[PDB]
């Protein structure tokens, strides 16, 4: 499911390496919007672009996509609400 969701959004076929649960408040400032509940931060590394690519979803079992973040080497984000 989820790497297909990444592929659709960014054209990159990637492997999620980790999924970290975060509170709404933990994610809010960085994203500039608060999610309704907890978020799983699912992260792949794009080796071609040297980018961290994060698909934020709601918690299991729904994993409803919330947001997608593309981060560079120095940690600057490109954010897209889904």
């Amino acid at each position: 499911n989820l790497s297909d969701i990444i592929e659709k959004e960014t054209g990159k076929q990637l492997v999620i390496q980790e999924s970290i649960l975060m509170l709404p408040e933990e994610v809010e400032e960085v994203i500039g919007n608060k999610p309704e509940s907890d978020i799983l931060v699912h992260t792949a590394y794009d080796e071609s672009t040297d980018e961290n690519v994060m698909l934020l979803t709601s918690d299991a079992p729904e994993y409803k996509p919330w947001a997608l973040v593309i981060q560079d080497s120095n940690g600057e984000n490109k954010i897209k609400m889904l």
Binding site: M22, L23, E25, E26, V27, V41, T43, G75
Partner: protein, 223 residues
């Protein structure tokens, strides 16, 4: 009991006989009967096997086990050689480079060298079904790991807890602040790391705290 280090078993033995733990085991058995579950049965309690319970000096809490093939091996953040360090571990290793002079990316993500020195690398949830993050939540593990964290708060003294991200702050909210040292930061995940995890110096600060007990420091470099 199989896969569980004896100094750990001796002290936690009441838990194993309790309904909730027994119902946890057969939930896990059921899961394995039908799906792949990580880590393998023989590595779920790896953290009980790298050191004795008395010898725990530092605790790092994690969430659940990596859910990709061969990643999790029963220590939080760590990956089985030669799997690449996941994104959070990449950032842990970035912090060590600037925090611990002489620290060198070991060229793998296996953290056992820390565990063998008394760094308890404890996930709050201990299994996961393949490819499904958080899929074994609230099946009993939270309750059991709460039992492990309580036991250490009660029975040991001067243990340094390094709590990363809010879920881990939560899980450590009752640690006896008189008997122990708690240090908190935001998660090393790339979403948050440049927002307090990088520059947190938790690894040297831990050793600074250990030195107050006349406790010998962790050699963070031995990986």
């Amino acid at each position: 009991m199989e896969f569980f280090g004896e100094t750990w078993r001796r002290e936690l033995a009441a838990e194993f006989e309790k309904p909730y733990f027994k119902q946890l085991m057969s939930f896990v058995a059921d899961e394995r009967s039908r799906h792949t579950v990580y880590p393998p049965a023989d590595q779920v309690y790896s953290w009980t096997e790298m050191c004795d319970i008395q010898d725990v000096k530092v605790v790092i809490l994690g969430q659940d086990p990596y859910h990709g093939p061969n990643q999790a091996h029963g220590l939080c953040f760590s990956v089985q050689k030669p799997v690449p360090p996941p994104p959070s571990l990449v950032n842990i290793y970035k912090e060590l480079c600037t925090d611990i002079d002489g620290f060198k990316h070991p060229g793998h993500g296996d953290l056992s060298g820390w565990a063998k020195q008394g760094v308890l690398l404890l996930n709050a949830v201990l299994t996961v079904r393949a490819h499904q993050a958080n899929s074994h939540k609230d099946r009993g593990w939270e309750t059991f790991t709460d039992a492990v964290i309580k036991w250490l708060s009660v029975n040991r003294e001067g243990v340094v807890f390094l709590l990363w991200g809010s879920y881990a702050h939560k899980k450590g909210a009752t640690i006896d602040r008189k008997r122990h040292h708690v240090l908190q930061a935001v998660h090393p995940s790339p979403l948050s790391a440049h927002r307090g995890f990088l520059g947190c110096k938790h690894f040297s600060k831990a050793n600074g705290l250990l030195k107050l007990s006349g406790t010998e420091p962790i050699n963070w470099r031995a990986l």
